[PDB]
Design a binder for this molecule. Structure first.
Ligand SMILES: Cc1cc2nc3c(=O)[nH]c(=O)nc-3n(C[C@H](O)[C@H](O)[C@H](O)COP(=O)(O)OP(=O)(O)OC[C@H]3O[C@@H](n4cnc5c(N)ncnc54)[C@H](O)[C@@H]3O)c2cc1C
Ligand SMILES: NC(=O)c1ccc[n+]([C@@H]2O[C@H](COP(=O)([O-])OP(=O)(O)OC[C@H]3O[C@@H](n4cnc5c(N)ncnc54)[C@H](OP(=O)(O)O)[C@@H]3O)[C@@H](O)[C@H]2O)c1
Ligand SMILES: O=C1CCCCCO1
Length: 529
């Protein structure tokens, strides 16, 4: 039983920064934990081939330390998993953080002790810590989703989830199946196709994707970025999604067809999924006709790329362009390869997995050495629901969030005093590092304020929390993303109640809300002295 000021759960971007603020700016005794053997979070787990950010390299990082920003370098316009991991290990060493963390150590329970006004946190090695504050940075795309298939456990080959890819494992020369064609599946398929002996893709919902445009960067282009870094970050912080481009306000149907095509073509040539969805016109996410113009443009490209009409039919995206926008380094062109087969599982479902592979309902065995599951995540709330977390009077997080998960401001919830979340439910949907920093900075200020002012507990009221839920819901219902049927609204997991899970007002609005709450003496919080 060690006693400390603060516990941080997670050693991704969130947890790394939170330990830094709580320790060096607030002078609090702070311990961090990760199940992982080192820092990096997402970029520690997802070592699958092709893993690559869709935020441009110069913005997928911390902004808080002006010297670090001048020191870091990168090879290309987007940054790969090993490069991000190295960046994060460098942050941890640069700021002497490593000593706060217990790696290979899962937090298994966190229990609030009403009389003592402390959290009791236990690890899977039986260590017990008591803390005044808990900061949860457990990842909104971290709890793996791994569907059961009939017969899966008779399979004699290897099975791998992409977000648990063992470092070093290569599938070169093997016969491989991939289940999943979201952001991960596209990357893994594109990068496996040239090295595997045969690839079979099991596609349930083909998605819309545009080119990433990942180009080599020399040490000069990067010099110009580094020379304007202050303004770069100021604009990012004052945009909606903080991806580094100007979010358009131009309505798509207010220009001619010719011009519309030209604007989409320029975005397509330039690259980037978010730029396609938000850099071109201002209403692709809120107006049906604007959505359909963007969708048709992409469908027409698929048609020109994939040469076999039957293959193209199976890969043709349909319906609203309303999932997380995807981009790729040659995904659709993979299906022109003779060692790649697409299996459209909505029309030819999986019958079962047997010793040697996957059998479809047409009676064909797809013979496979390895099955890769790019089946995504129990997003946002999944890592909370899996830990034993109990608040005031032993209320379990799963009974508190008995239906949808909720927060006040994305960083707190009622009945859990002195307990904060980084990227909890109902927070911003943006390039995430600058949102993580907004939240960590705001939590650190709040804890600092509590310590200075002798506050014993802070927690949001149920009224404020309900208002925040309603605000998220209203903003969501004004967009088409409601009908996209993906992880973003909890619709990807059998047994998960679909719900709003994000505040979609953008980083500029989010930051203004957060700063006003703090300037106003923590409006919506109950504060006990
Ligand atoms: C393949 C991939 C690509 C992505 N690309 C982008 C992108 O381009 N742009 C973008 O903005 N976002 C992207 N994301 C989202 C990305 O997760 C965030 O950018 C960011 O890495 C989140 O960092 P985090 O610290 O909040 O959580 P994570 O990096 O998910 O770290 C959470 C950590 O908590 C640990 N943990 C959880 N529960 C426990 C427990 N009980 N005890 C101990 N440890 C625990 C986990 O092991 C994990 O290491 C991507 C995600 C994935 C999976
Ligand atoms: N920066 C990047 O380039 C990058 C890369 C990877 C991940 N990410 C982030 O991580 C998020 C999640 O991405 P992801 O691709 O891992 O997950 P995802 O978008 O949730 O996609 C999961 C895929 O698995 C399929 N699937 C799920 N269950 C299945 C089942 N039982 N049988 C057959 N198919 C099944 C889904 O089909 P349906 O659509 O039919 O459900 C979908 O194609 C992304 O949206 C993005 O935010 C980003
Ligand atoms: O890939 C990501 C993570 C989901 C939320 C913002 C979009 O960028």
């Amino acid at each position: 039983t060690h006693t400390v000021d603060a516990v941080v759960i997670g050693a991704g971007f969130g947890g790394i920064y939170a330990v830094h603020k709580l320790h060096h700016e607030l002078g609090l005794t702070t311990v961090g934990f990760d199940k992982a053997d080192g820092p990096g979070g997402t970029w520690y787990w997802n070592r699958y081939p092709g893993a690559l950010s869709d935020t441009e390299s110069h913005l997928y990082r911390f902004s808080f330390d002006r010297d670090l920003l001048q020191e870091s370098t990168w090879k290309t316009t987007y940054i790969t998993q090993p490069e991000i991991l190295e960046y994060l290990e460098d942050v941890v060493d640069r700021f002497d953080l490593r000593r706060h963390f217990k790696f290979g150590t899962e937090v298994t329970s966190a229990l609030y002790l009403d009389d003592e006004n402390l959290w009791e946190v236990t690890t899977d090695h039986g260590e017990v810590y008591r803390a005044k504050y808990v900061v949860n940075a457990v990842g909104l795309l971290s709890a793996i989703n791994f569907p059961n298939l009939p017969g899966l456990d008779t399979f004699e080959g290897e099975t791998i989830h992409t977000a648990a890819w063992p470092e070093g494992k290569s599938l070169a020369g093997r016969r491989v199946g991939v289940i999943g064609t979201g952001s991960t599946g596209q990357q893994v398929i594109t990068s496996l196709a040239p090295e595997v002996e045969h690839l079979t893709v099991f596609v349930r919902t083909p998605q819309y994707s545009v080119p990433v445009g990942n180009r080599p960067v020399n040490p000069e282009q990067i010099a110009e970025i580094k020379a304007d870094y202050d303004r770069i970050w100021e604009r990012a912080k004052n945009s909606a999604v903080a991806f580094g481009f100007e979010e358009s306000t131009l309505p798509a149907m207010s220009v001619s067809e010719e011009e519309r095509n030209r604007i989409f073509q320029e975005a397509w040539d330039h690259g980037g999924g978010f730029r396609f969805m938000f850099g071109t016109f201002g209403d692709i996410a809120t107006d049906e006709a604007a959505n359909e113009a963007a969708a048709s443009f992409i469908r027409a490209k698929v048609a020109e790329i994939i040469e076999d009409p039957e293959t193209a039919r199976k890969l043709m995206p349909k319906g609203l362009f309303a999932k997380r926008p995807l981009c790729d380094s040659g995904y659709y062109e993979v299906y022109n390869r003779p060692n790649v087969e697409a299996v459209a599982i909505k029309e030819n479902p999986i019958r079962e997995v047997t010793a040697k592979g996957v059998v479809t309902e047409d009676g064909v065995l797809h013979e496979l050495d390895v099955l890769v599951f790019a089946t995504g995540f129990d997003a946002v709330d999944g890592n909370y629901r899996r830990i034993e977390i109990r608040g005031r009077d032993g209320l379990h997080i799963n009974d508190h969030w008995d239906g949808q998960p909720t927060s006040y401001l994305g960083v707190s919830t009622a009945n859990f005093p002195n307990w904060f979340m980084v990227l909890g439910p109902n927070g911003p949907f943006t390039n995430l590092p600058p949102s993580i920093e907004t939240q960590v900075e705001w939590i650190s200020d709040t804890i600092g304020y509590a310590e200075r002012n002798g506050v014993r507990a802070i927690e949001p009221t149920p009224e404020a929390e309900a208002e925040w839920t309603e605000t998220c819901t209203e903003i969501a219902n004004a967009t088409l993303f409601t009908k996209g049927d993906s992880w973003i609204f909890g619709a990807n997991i059998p047994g998960k109640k679909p719900s709003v899970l994000f505040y979609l007002g953008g980083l500029r609005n989010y930051r203004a809300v957060m700063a006003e709450v703090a300037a106003d003496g923590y409006r919506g919080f109950e504060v006990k002295s």
